[PDB]
Symmetry: D2
Subunit: 304 residues, 4 copies
Amino acid sequence: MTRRIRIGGAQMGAISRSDSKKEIVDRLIALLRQASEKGCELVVFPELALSTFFPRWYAERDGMDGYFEDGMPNAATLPLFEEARRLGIGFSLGYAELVQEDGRVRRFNTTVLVERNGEIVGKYRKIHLPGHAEYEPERSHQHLEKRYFEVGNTGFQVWDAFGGRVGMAICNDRRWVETYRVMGLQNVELILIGYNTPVNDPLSGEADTLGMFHNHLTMQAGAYQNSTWVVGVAKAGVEDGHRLMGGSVIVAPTGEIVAQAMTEGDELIVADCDLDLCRYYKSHIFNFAAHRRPEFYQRITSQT
Amino acid sequence: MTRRIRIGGAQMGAISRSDSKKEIVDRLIALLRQASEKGCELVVFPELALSTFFPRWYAERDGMDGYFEDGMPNAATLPLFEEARRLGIGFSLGYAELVQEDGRVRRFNTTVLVERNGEIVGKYRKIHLPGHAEYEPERSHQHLEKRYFEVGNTGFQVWDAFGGRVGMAICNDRRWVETYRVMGLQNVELILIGYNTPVNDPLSGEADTLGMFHNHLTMQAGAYQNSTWVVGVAKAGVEDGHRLMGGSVIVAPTGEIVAQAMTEGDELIVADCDLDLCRYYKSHIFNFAAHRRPEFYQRITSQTGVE
Amino acid sequence: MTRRIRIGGAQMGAISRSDSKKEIVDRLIALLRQASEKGCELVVFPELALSTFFPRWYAERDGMDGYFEDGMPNAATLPLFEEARRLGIGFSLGYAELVQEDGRVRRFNTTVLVERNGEIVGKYRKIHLPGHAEYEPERSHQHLEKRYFEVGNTGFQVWDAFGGRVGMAICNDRRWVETYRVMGLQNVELILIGYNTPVNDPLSGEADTLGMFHNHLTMQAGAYQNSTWVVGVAKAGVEDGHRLMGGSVIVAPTGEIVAQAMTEGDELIVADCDLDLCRYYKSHIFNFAAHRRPEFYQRITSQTGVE
Amino acid sequence: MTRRIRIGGAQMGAISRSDSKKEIVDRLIALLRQASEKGCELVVFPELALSTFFPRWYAERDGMDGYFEDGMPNAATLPLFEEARRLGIGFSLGYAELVQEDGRVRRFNTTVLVERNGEIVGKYRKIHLPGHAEYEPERSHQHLEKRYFEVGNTGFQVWDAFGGRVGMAICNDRRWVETYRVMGLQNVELILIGYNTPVNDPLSGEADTLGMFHNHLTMQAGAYQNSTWVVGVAKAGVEDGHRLMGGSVIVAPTGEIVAQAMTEGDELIVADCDLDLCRYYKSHIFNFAAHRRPEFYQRITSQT
């Protein structure tokens, strides 16, 4: 399915330890009305947008649940759904999902996708957990996503959404060619990726002069190599003495950046994304069929 | 120099269908000499570097063999092998392999890797063939590589060579994320990709402005996403009225471009390549613990096409 | 917000010499209505947006005038002025000016700046005419802009418009550093540069691979080195079998590109342009870290050519 | 080989306060032997190559004179020249020139251009002096070039050298379009620029994510808009807890980056540069005299 959709990249400034959830949620609602006054049918929020990036903070493995969410539409998060449904906007919202299964607690790094009528289209849970499970002393900053999260049971699902084929990856998911390719082989036309990337290297304690190089290099190639719109929205800023990288971008099926956010705070980038351009380029069978020969890709499934 | 090589990308200019072999090969020896004048240990030639791009010409499937190679070092291509052993320079060299194997003649888009002592390290046979096998008469130019080559039976091998782990791929293999991963998953540290990419669009008869963007884009993300050196050597220029893109690059395991050709002709670019950055960047994939999941990937190896 | 403008670049598809004026002007109006659906406060149109690129055509140095305008809002272009005022959108609009100034009949390559209330703020007349005065048979395509236009007598003016300071320049003006400097030295907050740039080089009849690279490069440094926004709007497409470059772009005062066009047809990009950033960077990137020493910059006015 | 010069960009690593000038001069001599053993005829050293970047340290205005130079072939630097002479290599060498005159003390940021036969082709002195003159506590790091240096009294001299037209500019000269334009109208074919660029912003003590962006964009467009080779060579590294960017590049008259350095340490980038390609572009359109209309450029001499 295919047509022409206006996406709002709703980049977020910092959130601190101090901030009340009401502030953060008003901050999302403000971006929402902005995308609304701009015709955006879909608006994309970042990873862990209801929170600070608490993986830089050491605590028992059940010591973060305050930052998590017991249900998706919450008392806390319910005005954000009322508004989105009232204005008839859909939104991808990254958050920290708290869920009970067999009587144990299960904690995922989740993004929920909600259709313009206000009803959930789905839920992705982060597959690639970066960081380390334990406290590692010789590092200027900490990254304990493994300590506070389990590998999601979702998989890389691509849904019939917003008049096209929509998929969702999360953050460092975007450095692995698998994330794009898996959703690719599903005819995905719109991959939504929210992200928090620290600006410095933890091993050296220094800034990665190549940080946005890599941030944009992985997404443009994904887009291009898979003929898919790719939307990357940042939570940037200095949270609690820790700077995150901005550079949110809407990327075309061809690899072209069409929208870039110049700040490290709340910023709504925006662009009209013909989903049908994707389906066209996917008709490369004309000449460059170069047809998938899975007989040779086998190593990708014994490891990767 | 803990494990460090001076690679040369010896990008080539045009080859007409009116060019003599000895011409083609003297040119190859020309660039091989150039490299020795710059202390190059490895030299990466282009794809199908002993012949014009005959995939743009129509003919019977067996009708192009006057271009192939009856053996890899033959009488024609022997002096290129001798002047490299003499100089102690390894090379990778792309050609059209004619071979009788499995009791019948076979035809591949091949690259051979020759180590400095003059000994063949490995062969790789192109997997991804683009284009069409029948004449498609609404395009400005024909891409008949499907008609003239068989898919390669090599796999994406990676070899102990030149002090590290060195694989090879050819042309539009550099469009497919798989090419790098598979090789990356054998601890590759250098990937030699020669190529021919017509500048004009086949179905538009007009240049792809994104021709070059896409060239360096896929190769740069490939170096990055597998912490591997990626050397891409073009054959470029107007060949019998068809212009081949240039842009030969040496790209570092950070994705950074460290050498670019600026001509569509015979040209050489040189960089020292620390094969150890690759080994180090792979074990700083620990804080960014992949702990990557091959269970979510199975779509990559199951279906050929797309659901 | 704080002196922010929602600017729209209205990149235009091709114009044949068969195209009616009603067609061209409706298309101009087409984009203007689009830009109102997106709440644009300014609409930057291309250069010579009221006719094709007749510099590619040989003719009497006075037998091009069916492409010129008798007056700036004329009976034909009147609708586009009306509909812009009726919606509250300012615009900048490139055209070919026929005026009986200094007694004689004078001909320029002009853009005009019109504000939201409907009132003309300024007019810039191209200073840098490229190409040649005469027919040049050894060039693949002709550029006769010197033969149909006189040098502009406006200077690089910078008016108070749209909440800040906005200047204008046209096409290959965006190549000469002088363009942004002069205008930036007048505290320009925003620069409108419409353009037609063929993709093929005139000697080779072959597309410059570094055609768009140069395009963005010269306009990005300009935005950067004068802490000014640079909105460059193309007319693009195959026009009567001549292809103009696309790549329209809004560049921020940092040098960053924040909106691009991916097509060579009628297309509109939008971006909120904080005119305050310009004045922020100006008193910081020109900190006491900058002092400009014009005693040494004296060749830029002394001579016109290299020595 | 002719109209064609093999340049080597001799990027340096850190020089800390605690180094001997014998360490430093050896490290430049080390680089010189690599350009010889790689074939270089001209080898370009960076700005302030004989000391740490002392303009980050507060002192009397004659206080940082131990980092300056008595005369150019010193006791300390005389081995660098003798070697360069033997290997028949010319070099650009940046340094803090101390020069006496009319009983007074004059102080410059100076690069000397030495020819392959060992003889000095000339000397440029920085015109564009960044930073401030007095101490300023509201910035995380200091620039006092204006305090310790004087505006140079050479201007952008272009000389005949290496079979071509060679000019010099220094460090943050490379941001001013006047640097390249002035030298281009002299038929410059090769602009040598050494530099030290702190990678944090002084005001915020934040890394300038655009730092290397900006570092390449000014030099590329300079090359292109003036049909010239532009060689840019850094001193990079952490000097006493202050970090300088790297990004040493040889740049074509097309504006194309043809060699780039990956480290923030001693690195020799090298490239073969047709000086005639300049004159091709210079006379294939891009004639200044044909389009230049300096009745309109007049503000460039009245204000800046």
